[PDB]
Amino acid sequence: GRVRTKTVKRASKALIERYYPKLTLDFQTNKRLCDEIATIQSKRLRNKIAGYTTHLMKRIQKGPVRGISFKLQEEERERKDQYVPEVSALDLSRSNGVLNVDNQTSDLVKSLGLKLPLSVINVSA
Amino acid sequence: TRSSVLADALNAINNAEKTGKRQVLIRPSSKVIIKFLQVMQKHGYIGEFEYIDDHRSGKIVVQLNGRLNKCGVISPRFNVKIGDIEKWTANLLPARQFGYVILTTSAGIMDHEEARRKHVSGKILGFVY
């Protein structure tokens, strides 16, 4: 089997996690791209790395891969806070201002000493 | 059957201290258990203890703090001489600074130091340290 070496794999992983956008589906541009950005000592190894970056540009255009890309990581930096609801489920208007509370928790409310808009609901089994 | 009542009392105290609680339920009572826990109390090895009446024979609550690493009973109540006090004081105590042997003497129940300085002896019950 022609399993590629780990140096070519790791160099392609670094150059695609950091230098994504100028690499494309054409190997011939990627050859002098990795010439102009990377100092690789031999023509054979830089051909290996440029062909592997071409192949990872081939399958990256169909979907996301487990490795790091920037243009997704801004997006899960506003995924943390962009979907704040104006009214949550914990607000009063989703139950018309009066809570759906059984008799025992209303006994907790009247025993602890607080005033609260509760509707007693009778539940069994 | 239940042979000694002091033995089950002190075994219950030792078990409830080795599991680390702060209160026991000693059952039943005697003169001997009451006076034994008074001997522990005068040295401050236990805190409050409390006696509940029930008209049969009373249950005792002892609120033990932490201070008793082991008390115990010597169940064949051997007759001890004045000169035999050093043998039990060397065999069951940790060292020569603390640690007590409780005797029943004809002047009453007292520890081994009080039996030394009373200059009496009697029969051995147990040991509190």
């Binding site: 943390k80 914990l90 409310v109 | -």
Partner: protein, 206 residues
């Protein structure tokens, strides 16, 4: 040893009963019997929420008692818990552990996941039990969020809540965050509600 303003404000009690924190599991351990008040007769117990408020008041005092705010570490592996602890670590400056907590992180200084805390918060002590037992080796207090059938060993100041629902865990992390920022001094007025809503901590799966 606390002022009288610190207690249950009724909007927080409405907020607590809105998130269904008072509902719990079916087994009641010997240790956590005082947290239950009584049982709704299907098999679901209801918990004293004043105990949850004052217990998280203790946990807030533990977190505020540390001198270095980066030395407290939040632990999570539940799906709601990663979002909850990253919001808490964003808002108080704690060090979060999201996803798989690395074994050998509390001993074994070689690993780059070695952090030694002085204080550890855990989402539940059953699924994140390995951080509990590795913190049991290097003398660390752990304040935790325990259910009514959680393992109660090796925890101290444990907050009864519901770890099953996303409402209760996101809210209870939010309330711990707002309690410690109201206790540190970032929000001066005790009367003023905190500007961030609790639904920021809430998990959504798209």
């Amino acid at each position: 040893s606390l002022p009288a303003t610190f207690d249950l404000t009724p909007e927080d009690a409405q907020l607590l009963l809105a998130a269904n924190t008072h509902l719990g599991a079916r087994n009641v351990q010997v240790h956590q019997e005082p947290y239950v008040f009584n049982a709704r007769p299907d098999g679901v117990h209801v918990i004293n929420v004043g105990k949850t408020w004052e217990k998280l008041v203790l946990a807030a005092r533990i977190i505020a008692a540390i001198p270095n705010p980066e030395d407290v570490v939040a632990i999570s592996s539940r799906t709601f818990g990663q979002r909850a602890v990253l919001k808490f670590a964003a808002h108080t400056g704690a060090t979060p552990i999201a996803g798989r907590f690395t074994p050998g992180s509390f001993t074994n200084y070689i690993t780059r996941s070695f952090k030694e805390p002085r204080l550890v918060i855990v989402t539940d002590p059953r699924s994140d039990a390995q951080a509990i037992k590795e913190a049991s080796y290097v003398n660390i207090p752990v304040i935790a969020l325990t259910d009514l059938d959680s393992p109660s060993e090796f925890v101290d100041v444990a907050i009864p809540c519901n770890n099953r629902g996303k409402h209760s865990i996101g809210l209870i992390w939010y309330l711990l965050a707002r309690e410690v920022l109201r206790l540190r001094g970032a929000l001066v007025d005790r009367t003023q509600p905190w500007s961030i809503m609790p639904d920021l901590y809430f998990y959504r799966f798209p």
